[PDB]
Design an enzyme around this catalytic site. Structure first.
Site, mmCIF file in Angstrom:
data_model
loop_
_atom_site.group_PDB
_atom_site.id
_atom_site.type_symbol
_atom_site.label_atom_id
_atom_site.label_comp_id
_atom_site.label_asym_id
_atom_site.label_seq_id
_atom_site.Cartn_x
_atom_site.Cartn_y
_atom_site.Cartn_z
ATOM 1 N N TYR A 1 34.115 48.294 32.635
ATOM 2 C CA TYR A 1 33.238 47.722 31.621
ATOM 3 C C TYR A 1 32.101 46.939 32.253
ATOM 4 C CZ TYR A 1 31.274 45.233 27.771
ATOM 5 O OH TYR A 1 30.364 44.768 26.829
ATOM 6 N N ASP B 1 39.651 52.933 34.792
ATOM 7 C CA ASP B 1 39.855 52.505 33.387
ATOM 8 C C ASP B 1 38.538 52.523 32.629
ATOM 9 O OD1 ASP B 1 41.986 51.031 31.556
ATOM 10 O OD2 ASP B 1 40.126 49.877 31.375
ATOM 11 N N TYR C 1 33.039 51.431 25.878
ATOM 12 C CA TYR C 1 32.275 50.961 27.020
ATOM 13 C C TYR C 1 30.932 51.687 27.157
ATOM 14 C CZ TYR C 1 36.838 49.111 28.528
ATOM 15 O OH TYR C 1 38.083 48.518 28.598
ATOM 16 N N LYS D 1 40.339 55.083 25.943
ATOM 17 C CA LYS D 1 40.932 54.314 24.839
ATOM 18 C C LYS D 1 40.310 54.724 23.516
ATOM 19 C CE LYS D 1 41.449 50.417 28.060
ATOM 20 N NZ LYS D 1 40.155 50.482 28.829
ATOM 21 N N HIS E 1 43.147 51.057 21.737
ATOM 22 C CA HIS E 1 42.458 49.950 22.417
ATOM 23 C C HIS E 1 42.885 48.573 21.883
ATOM 24 C CE1 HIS E 1 38.317 49.229 24.606
ATOM 25 N NE2 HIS E 1 39.078 48.160 24.765
ATOM 26 N N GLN F 1 48.330 47.457 27.875
ATOM 27 C CA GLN F 1 47.265 46.821 28.651
ATOM 28 C C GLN F 1 46.792 45.547 27.953
ATOM 29 O OE1 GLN F 1 42.695 47.667 29.597
ATOM 30 N NE2 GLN F 1 44.047 49.312 30.378
ATOM 31 N N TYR G 1 44.468 43.082 32.422
ATOM 32 C CA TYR G 1 43.018 43.032 32.443
ATOM 33 C C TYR G 1 42.547 41.596 32.475
ATOM 34 C CZ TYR G 1 42.379 42.223 27.284
ATOM 35 O OH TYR G 1 42.350 41.710 25.977
ATOM 36 N N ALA H 1 42.122 40.167 35.124
ATOM 37 C CA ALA H 1 43.011 39.615 36.122
ATOM 38 C C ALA H 1 42.271 38.733 37.107
ATOM 39 C CB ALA H 1 43.744 40.736 36.883
ATOM 40 N N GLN I 1 34.639 38.550 32.907
ATOM 41 C CA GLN I 1 33.223 38.512 33.243
ATOM 42 C C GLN I 1 32.524 37.324 32.619
ATOM 43 O OE1 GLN I 1 31.285 42.418 33.307
ATOM 44 N NE2 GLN I 1 33.297 43.443 33.066
ATOM 45 N N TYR J 1 31.063 45.544 40.121
ATOM 46 C CA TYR J 1 29.932 46.414 40.293
ATOM 47 C C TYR J 1 29.212 46.095 41.587
ATOM 48 C CZ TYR J 1 29.975 49.016 35.793
ATOM 49 O OH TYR J 1 30.233 49.885 34.748
ATOM 50 N N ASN K 1 38.606 44.470 47.182
ATOM 51 C CA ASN K 1 39.769 44.449 46.297
ATOM 52 C C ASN K 1 40.852 45.433 46.715
ATOM 53 O OD1 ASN K 1 38.522 42.463 44.845
ATOM 54 N ND2 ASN K 1 37.734 43.847 43.227
#
Ligand code: NAP
Ligand code: A1EC0
Length: 315
Positions: A19, A45, A50, A79, A112, A185, A211, A213, A217, A267, A275
Protein backbone atom coordinates in the site's frame (compact mmCIF):
# COMPACT_ATOMS: atom_id res chain seq x y z
CA UNK A 1 10.77 -20.07 5.69
CA UNK A 2 7.09 -20.84 5.17
CA UNK A 3 4.23 -21.88 7.40
CA UNK A 4 1.88 -24.68 6.38
CA UNK A 5 -1.70 -23.41 6.13
CA UNK A 6 -4.70 -25.41 7.27
CA UNK A 7 -5.58 -26.26 3.62
CA UNK A 8 -2.11 -27.76 3.01
CA UNK A 9 -0.70 -24.79 1.11
CA UNK A 10 2.39 -22.89 2.22
CA UNK A 11 2.81 -19.14 3.00
CA UNK A 12 6.19 -17.37 3.28
CA UNK A 13 6.52 -15.93 6.79
CA UNK A 14 7.76 -12.53 5.56
CA UNK A 15 5.57 -10.60 3.13
CA UNK A 16 6.01 -7.34 1.23
CA UNK A 17 3.37 -4.70 1.89
CA UNK A 18 2.38 -2.74 -1.17
CA UNK A 19 0.00 0.00 0.00
CA UNK A 20 1.05 3.54 -0.84
CA UNK A 21 -1.15 6.62 -0.42
CA UNK A 22 -2.67 8.07 -3.59
CA UNK A 23 -0.09 10.92 -3.68
CA UNK A 24 2.53 8.28 -4.59
CA UNK A 25 2.67 7.72 -8.37
CA UNK A 26 1.58 4.23 -9.43
CA UNK A 27 4.90 3.76 -11.26
CA UNK A 28 6.51 3.45 -7.82
CA UNK A 29 4.55 0.28 -6.94
CA UNK A 30 5.93 -1.29 -10.12
CA UNK A 31 9.53 -0.32 -9.26
CA UNK A 32 9.49 -1.31 -5.60
CA UNK A 33 7.75 -4.65 -6.14
CA UNK A 34 10.55 -5.60 -8.50
CA UNK A 35 13.10 -4.48 -5.90
CA UNK A 36 11.33 -6.55 -3.21
CA UNK A 37 11.47 -9.65 -5.40
CA UNK A 38 15.14 -8.92 -6.14
CA UNK A 39 15.75 -8.62 -2.40
CA UNK A 40 14.21 -12.03 -1.69
CA UNK A 41 10.56 -11.31 -0.92
CA UNK A 42 8.28 -14.00 -2.30
CA UNK A 43 5.05 -13.08 -0.51
CA UNK A 44 3.44 -9.93 -1.96
CA UNK A 45 0.35 -8.34 -0.28
CA UNK A 46 -2.00 -6.29 -2.45
CA UNK A 47 -5.74 -5.53 -2.66
CA UNK A 48 -8.39 -4.00 -4.85
CA UNK A 49 -8.39 -1.01 -2.46
CA UNK A 50 -4.76 -0.22 -3.14
CA UNK A 51 -5.19 0.79 -6.82
CA UNK A 52 -1.94 -1.00 -7.60
CA UNK A 53 -2.74 -4.55 -8.72
CA UNK A 54 -1.89 -3.68 -12.33
CA UNK A 55 1.59 -2.51 -11.28
CA UNK A 56 2.25 -5.25 -8.77
CA UNK A 57 1.21 -7.76 -11.44
CA UNK A 58 3.48 -6.11 -14.02
CA UNK A 59 6.39 -6.38 -11.54
CA UNK A 60 5.71 -10.12 -11.03
CA UNK A 61 5.46 -10.75 -14.80
CA UNK A 62 8.68 -8.83 -15.40
CA UNK A 63 10.60 -10.82 -12.80
CA UNK A 64 9.25 -14.04 -14.32
CA UNK A 65 10.38 -12.91 -17.77
CA UNK A 66 13.83 -11.99 -16.31
CA UNK A 67 14.13 -15.59 -15.20
CA UNK A 68 14.47 -14.36 -11.59
CA UNK A 69 11.44 -16.29 -10.29
CA UNK A 70 8.70 -18.58 -11.53
CA UNK A 71 5.01 -17.87 -10.91
CA UNK A 72 4.95 -20.85 -8.53
CA UNK A 73 7.66 -19.18 -6.39
CA UNK A 74 5.52 -16.12 -5.68
CA UNK A 75 2.76 -15.97 -3.07
CA UNK A 76 0.39 -13.22 -4.20
CA UNK A 77 -2.44 -11.99 -1.98
CA UNK A 78 -5.40 -9.90 -3.03
CA UNK A 79 -8.41 -8.77 -1.03
CA UNK A 80 -12.16 -8.46 -1.63
CA UNK A 81 -13.16 -4.88 -0.90
CA UNK A 82 -16.15 -4.20 1.34
CA UNK A 83 -18.43 -2.92 -1.39
CA UNK A 84 -18.28 -6.45 -2.89
CA UNK A 85 -19.50 -8.53 0.07
CA UNK A 86 -22.82 -9.45 -1.50
CA UNK A 87 -22.19 -13.02 -2.64
CA UNK A 88 -22.92 -12.51 -6.35
CA UNK A 89 -20.20 -9.78 -6.47
CA UNK A 90 -17.38 -11.89 -5.01
CA UNK A 91 -16.25 -13.98 -7.95
CA UNK A 92 -16.53 -11.04 -10.43
CA UNK A 93 -14.42 -8.89 -8.06
CA UNK A 94 -11.79 -11.65 -7.89
CA UNK A 95 -11.80 -12.13 -11.66
CA UNK A 96 -11.39 -8.36 -12.10
CA UNK A 97 -8.39 -8.35 -9.78
CA UNK A 98 -6.88 -11.22 -11.75
CA UNK A 99 -7.46 -9.38 -15.02
CA UNK A 100 -5.73 -6.23 -13.73
CA UNK A 101 -2.75 -8.22 -12.36
CA UNK A 102 -2.69 -10.42 -15.49
CA UNK A 103 -2.57 -13.48 -13.27
CA UNK A 104 -4.45 -16.76 -13.60
CA UNK A 105 -4.90 -17.24 -9.84
CA UNK A 106 -4.04 -15.61 -6.51
CA UNK A 107 -2.33 -17.58 -3.81
CA UNK A 108 -4.54 -15.97 -1.16
CA UNK A 109 -7.83 -14.07 -1.37
CA UNK A 110 -9.05 -12.32 1.75
CA UNK A 111 -12.17 -10.58 2.88
CA UNK A 112 -10.52 -7.21 3.48
CA UNK A 113 -12.75 -6.15 6.38
CA UNK A 114 -15.95 -7.37 8.02
CA UNK A 115 -17.50 -3.90 7.61
CA UNK A 116 -19.73 -4.09 4.53
CA UNK A 117 -20.32 -0.98 2.40
CA UNK A 118 -22.95 0.04 -0.14
CA UNK A 119 -22.36 -1.93 -3.39
CA UNK A 120 -21.10 0.11 -6.32
CA UNK A 121 -18.00 1.12 -8.22
CA UNK A 122 -17.16 3.76 -5.62
CA UNK A 123 -14.76 2.34 -3.05
CA UNK A 124 -15.90 4.84 -0.42
CA UNK A 125 -19.61 5.45 -1.06
CA UNK A 126 -20.67 8.62 0.73
CA UNK A 127 -24.06 10.18 1.40
CA UNK A 128 -25.09 13.84 1.17
CA UNK A 129 -23.58 14.48 4.65
CA UNK A 130 -20.17 13.00 3.84
CA UNK A 131 -20.87 9.82 5.79
CA UNK A 132 -19.68 6.52 4.36
CA UNK A 133 -22.73 4.37 3.54
CA UNK A 134 -22.85 0.98 5.23
CA UNK A 135 -24.51 -2.21 3.93
CA UNK A 136 -25.82 -5.25 5.83
CA UNK A 137 -24.51 -8.57 4.52
CA UNK A 138 -24.40 -12.01 6.11
CA UNK A 139 -20.64 -12.63 5.97
CA UNK A 140 -21.33 -16.38 6.01
CA UNK A 141 -22.80 -15.96 2.52
CA UNK A 142 -19.74 -13.91 1.52
CA UNK A 143 -17.61 -16.74 2.82
CA UNK A 144 -19.59 -19.30 0.81
CA UNK A 145 -18.80 -17.29 -2.32
CA UNK A 146 -15.09 -17.25 -1.34
CA UNK A 147 -15.19 -21.05 -0.99
CA UNK A 148 -16.52 -21.30 -4.56
CA UNK A 149 -13.55 -19.15 -5.70
CA UNK A 150 -11.14 -21.67 -4.14
CA UNK A 151 -13.05 -24.55 -5.69
CA UNK A 152 -12.80 -22.85 -9.08
CA UNK A 153 -9.01 -22.64 -8.63
CA UNK A 154 -9.04 -18.84 -8.81
CA UNK A 155 -7.64 -18.60 -5.27
CA UNK A 156 -5.35 -21.29 -3.86
CA UNK A 157 -6.28 -20.34 -0.29
CA UNK A 158 -8.89 -18.05 1.29
CA UNK A 159 -8.82 -16.09 4.55
CA UNK A 160 -10.08 -12.96 6.30
CA UNK A 161 -8.70 -9.66 7.50
CA UNK A 162 -9.67 -7.42 10.41
CA UNK A 163 -11.91 -10.04 12.00
CA UNK A 164 -12.24 -10.30 15.76
CA UNK A 165 -12.80 -13.57 17.61
CA UNK A 166 -16.59 -13.53 17.46
CA UNK A 167 -16.45 -12.83 13.72
CA UNK A 168 -14.00 -15.71 13.19
CA UNK A 169 -16.26 -17.98 15.26
CA UNK A 170 -19.20 -17.03 13.07
CA UNK A 171 -17.32 -18.47 10.10
CA UNK A 172 -15.87 -21.47 11.99
CA UNK A 173 -19.31 -22.41 13.37
CA UNK A 174 -21.08 -21.96 10.03
CA UNK A 175 -23.21 -25.01 9.11
CA UNK A 176 -21.72 -26.80 6.13
CA UNK A 177 -18.44 -24.87 6.28
CA UNK A 178 -16.14 -26.31 3.61
CA UNK A 179 -12.91 -24.35 4.10
CA UNK A 180 -11.72 -22.64 7.26
CA UNK A 181 -9.96 -19.30 6.80
CA UNK A 182 -6.26 -19.98 6.53
CA UNK A 183 -5.42 -16.65 8.12
CA UNK A 184 -6.68 -13.50 9.75
CA UNK A 185 -4.66 -10.47 8.66
CA UNK A 186 -4.87 -7.89 11.47
CA UNK A 187 -3.05 -4.89 12.91
CA UNK A 188 -0.28 -6.30 15.11
CA UNK A 189 2.91 -4.73 16.53
CA UNK A 190 4.45 -4.33 19.99
CA UNK A 191 1.99 -1.55 20.97
CA UNK A 192 -0.94 -3.80 20.04
CA UNK A 193 0.37 -7.32 20.11
CA UNK A 194 -2.95 -9.22 19.81
CA UNK A 195 -1.86 -11.93 22.23
CA UNK A 196 -5.46 -12.94 22.99
CA UNK A 197 -6.42 -13.18 19.32
CA UNK A 198 -3.19 -14.94 18.53
CA UNK A 199 -3.84 -17.65 21.11
CA UNK A 200 -7.35 -18.09 19.71
CA UNK A 201 -6.06 -18.35 16.14
CA UNK A 202 -3.33 -20.82 17.14
CA UNK A 203 -5.99 -23.05 18.72
CA UNK A 204 -7.89 -23.09 15.42
CA UNK A 205 -4.81 -23.50 13.14
CA UNK A 206 -5.45 -20.04 11.68
CA UNK A 207 -2.33 -18.02 10.90
CA UNK A 208 -2.28 -14.47 12.22
CA UNK A 209 -0.73 -12.12 9.63
CA UNK A 210 0.53 -8.84 11.12
CA UNK A 211 0.05 -5.56 9.35
CA UNK A 212 1.36 -2.18 10.44
CA UNK A 213 4.04 -4.30 12.11
CA UNK A 214 6.41 -1.33 11.83
CA UNK A 215 3.87 1.11 13.30
CA UNK A 216 1.97 2.07 10.11
CA UNK A 217 2.61 4.80 7.59
CA UNK A 218 0.99 7.31 10.00
CA UNK A 219 -1.22 8.75 7.26
CA UNK A 220 -2.83 11.89 8.66
CA UNK A 221 -6.12 10.82 7.11
CA UNK A 222 -6.36 7.74 9.37
CA UNK A 223 -3.75 8.06 12.19
CA UNK A 224 -3.63 10.57 15.02
CA UNK A 225 -0.32 12.48 14.75
CA UNK A 226 0.05 12.44 18.54
CA UNK A 227 0.06 8.65 18.69
CA UNK A 228 3.44 7.29 19.76
CA UNK A 229 5.90 6.35 17.03
CA UNK A 230 6.54 2.63 17.33
CA UNK A 231 10.07 2.65 15.93
CA UNK A 232 11.12 5.35 18.43
CA UNK A 233 10.20 3.05 21.36
CA UNK A 234 13.09 3.01 23.86
CA UNK A 235 12.94 -0.77 24.40
CA UNK A 236 12.98 -1.48 20.67
CA UNK A 237 15.86 0.95 20.23
CA UNK A 238 17.84 -0.56 23.12
CA UNK A 239 17.33 -4.02 21.70
CA UNK A 240 18.40 -2.82 18.25
CA UNK A 241 21.61 -1.51 19.84
CA UNK A 242 22.24 -4.75 21.72
CA UNK A 243 21.77 -6.78 18.54
CA UNK A 244 23.42 -4.31 16.11
CA UNK A 245 20.20 -4.32 14.12
CA UNK A 246 17.48 -1.69 13.66
CA UNK A 247 14.22 -1.09 15.58
CA UNK A 248 12.32 -2.23 12.46
CA UNK A 249 14.22 -5.49 12.40
CA UNK A 250 13.48 -6.05 16.11
CA UNK A 251 9.76 -5.47 15.50
CA UNK A 252 9.70 -7.88 12.59
CA UNK A 253 11.73 -10.59 14.35
CA UNK A 254 9.40 -10.30 17.36
CA UNK A 255 6.51 -11.47 15.20
CA UNK A 256 8.40 -14.30 13.57
CA UNK A 257 9.37 -15.73 16.93
CA UNK A 258 5.80 -15.79 18.26
CA UNK A 259 4.45 -17.62 15.21
CA UNK A 260 3.02 -14.58 13.42
CA UNK A 261 3.52 -14.09 9.65
CA UNK A 262 4.67 -10.48 9.20
CA UNK A 263 4.20 -7.93 6.45
CA UNK A 264 6.51 -5.00 5.93
CA UNK A 265 5.91 -2.10 3.58
CA UNK A 266 8.81 -0.06 2.24
CA UNK A 267 9.12 1.96 -0.92
CA UNK A 268 12.81 2.59 -0.20
CA UNK A 269 15.31 0.22 -1.89
CA UNK A 270 17.67 0.15 1.09
CA UNK A 271 14.99 -0.51 3.71
CA UNK A 272 13.41 -3.20 1.48
CA UNK A 273 16.75 -5.02 1.44
CA UNK A 274 17.27 -4.40 5.15
CA UNK A 275 13.97 -6.02 6.11
CA UNK A 276 14.98 -9.37 4.58
CA UNK A 277 17.77 -9.46 7.24
CA UNK A 278 15.11 -10.44 9.80
CA UNK A 279 16.21 -13.99 9.13
CA UNK A 280 19.83 -13.29 10.13
CA UNK A 281 19.50 -12.95 13.90
CA UNK A 282 17.47 -14.12 16.87
CA UNK A 283 15.86 -12.52 19.95
CA UNK A 284 16.35 -14.19 23.30
CA UNK A 285 13.42 -15.28 25.43
CA UNK A 286 14.23 -12.32 27.72
CA UNK A 287 14.11 -9.99 24.74
CA UNK A 288 10.71 -11.39 23.76
CA UNK A 289 9.32 -10.83 27.23
CA UNK A 290 10.54 -7.22 27.22
CA UNK A 291 8.77 -6.59 23.90
CA UNK A 292 5.62 -8.37 25.19
CA UNK A 293 5.60 -5.70 27.88
CA UNK A 294 5.13 -2.86 25.42
CA UNK A 295 1.49 -3.48 24.50
CA UNK A 296 -0.74 -0.42 25.04
CA UNK A 297 -3.81 -1.47 23.04
CA UNK A 298 -2.83 1.20 20.52
CA UNK A 299 -4.67 0.96 17.17
CA UNK A 300 -3.13 2.99 14.40
CA UNK A 301 -6.06 1.89 12.20
CA UNK A 302 -8.76 2.64 14.67
CA UNK A 303 -11.37 3.58 12.05
CA UNK A 304 -12.94 6.01 14.53
CA UNK A 305 -15.65 7.31 12.20
CA UNK A 306 -16.73 3.67 11.69
CA UNK A 307 -17.17 2.73 15.38
CA UNK A 308 -20.93 2.70 14.77
CA UNK A 309 -20.70 0.04 12.05
CA UNK A 310 -22.35 -3.13 13.43
CA UNK A 311 -19.32 -5.13 12.29
CA UNK A 312 -16.69 -2.74 13.70
CA UNK A 313 -14.10 -5.18 15.03
CA UNK A 314 -13.05 -3.24 18.14
CA UNK A 315 -16.44 -3.38 19.92
N1 NAP B 1 -5.69 -5.86 5.76
C1 NAP B 1 -5.67 -4.45 6.08
O1 NAP B 1 -6.70 -3.87 6.41
C2 NAP B 1 -4.32 -3.76 6.10
C3 NAP B 1 -4.20 -2.57 6.76
C4 NAP B 1 -2.94 -2.01 6.78
C5 NAP B 1 -1.85 -2.58 6.12
N2 NAP B 1 -2.04 -3.73 5.41
C6 NAP B 1 -0.98 -4.40 4.57
O2 NAP B 1 0.22 -4.34 5.45
C7 NAP B 1 1.24 -3.55 4.69
C8 NAP B 1 2.20 -3.01 5.80
O3 NAP B 1 1.49 -2.19 6.75
P1 NAP B 1 1.66 -0.60 6.59
O4 NAP B 1 1.46 -0.08 5.22
O5 NAP B 1 0.82 -0.01 7.66
O6 NAP B 1 3.20 -0.26 6.95
P2 NAP B 1 4.37 -0.86 7.93
O7 NAP B 1 4.75 -2.22 7.40
O8 NAP B 1 3.92 -0.81 9.34
O9 NAP B 1 5.52 0.19 7.61
C9 NAP B 1 5.37 1.53 8.02
C10 NAP B 1 6.51 2.39 7.50
O10 NAP B 1 7.86 1.72 8.00
C11 NAP B 1 8.85 2.23 7.23
N3 NAP B 1 9.83 1.17 7.08
C12 NAP B 1 9.86 -0.03 6.46
N4 NAP B 1 11.01 -0.63 6.73
C13 NAP B 1 11.68 0.23 7.52
C14 NAP B 1 12.95 0.00 8.00
N5 NAP B 1 13.85 -1.11 7.88
N6 NAP B 1 13.52 0.94 8.83
C15 NAP B 1 12.80 2.06 9.11
N7 NAP B 1 11.52 2.29 8.61
C16 NAP B 1 10.98 1.34 7.80
C17 NAP B 1 8.17 2.41 5.85
O11 NAP B 1 8.50 3.60 5.23
P3 NAP B 1 9.36 3.60 3.77
O12 NAP B 1 8.40 3.19 2.71
O13 NAP B 1 9.74 5.09 3.72
O14 NAP B 1 10.55 2.76 3.95
C18 NAP B 1 6.64 2.33 6.17
O15 NAP B 1 6.00 3.52 5.55
C19 NAP B 1 0.54 -2.66 4.00
O16 NAP B 1 1.31 -2.10 2.90
C20 NAP B 1 -0.67 -3.64 3.46
O17 NAP B 1 0.04 -4.41 2.46
C21 NAP B 1 -3.23 -4.32 5.35
C1 A1EC0 C 1 -16.48 1.42 7.17
C2 A1EC0 C 1 -15.83 2.16 6.00
O1 A1EC0 C 1 -14.74 1.40 5.55
C3 A1EC0 C 1 -13.85 2.15 4.78
C4 A1EC0 C 1 -14.25 2.82 3.61
C5 A1EC0 C 1 -13.34 3.57 2.86
C6 A1EC0 C 1 -12.01 3.63 3.29
C7 A1EC0 C 1 -11.64 2.96 4.47
C8 A1EC0 C 1 -12.55 2.23 5.22
C9 A1EC0 C 1 -10.24 3.04 4.96
C10 A1EC0 C 1 -9.38 3.40 4.03
C11 A1EC0 C 1 -7.92 3.43 4.53
O2 A1EC0 C 1 -7.66 3.13 5.67
N1 A1EC0 C 1 -6.92 3.83 3.59
C12 A1EC0 C 1 -5.57 3.85 4.13
C13 A1EC0 C 1 -4.94 2.47 4.16
C14 A1EC0 C 1 -5.53 1.26 3.86
C15 A1EC0 C 1 -4.51 0.30 4.05
C16 A1EC0 C 1 -4.60 -1.19 3.85
O3 A1EC0 C 1 -3.53 -1.70 3.59
O4 A1EC0 C 1 -5.62 -1.89 3.85
C17 A1EC0 C 1 -3.31 1.02 4.43
C18 A1EC0 C 1 -1.82 0.57 4.75
O5 A1EC0 C 1 -3.67 2.29 4.46
C19 A1EC0 C 1 -9.76 3.78 2.62
O6 A1EC0 C 1 -11.01 4.38 2.56
Amino acid sequence: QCVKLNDGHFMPVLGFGTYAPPEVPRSKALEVTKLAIEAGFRHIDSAHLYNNEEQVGLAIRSKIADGSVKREDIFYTSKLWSTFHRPELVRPALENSLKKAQLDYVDLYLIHSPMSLKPGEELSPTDENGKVIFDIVDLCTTWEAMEKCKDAGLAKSIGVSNFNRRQLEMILNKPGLKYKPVCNQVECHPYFNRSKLLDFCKSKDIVLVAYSALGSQRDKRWVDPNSPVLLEDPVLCALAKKHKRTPALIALRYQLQRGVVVLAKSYNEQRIRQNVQVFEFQLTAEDMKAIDGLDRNLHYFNSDSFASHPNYPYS
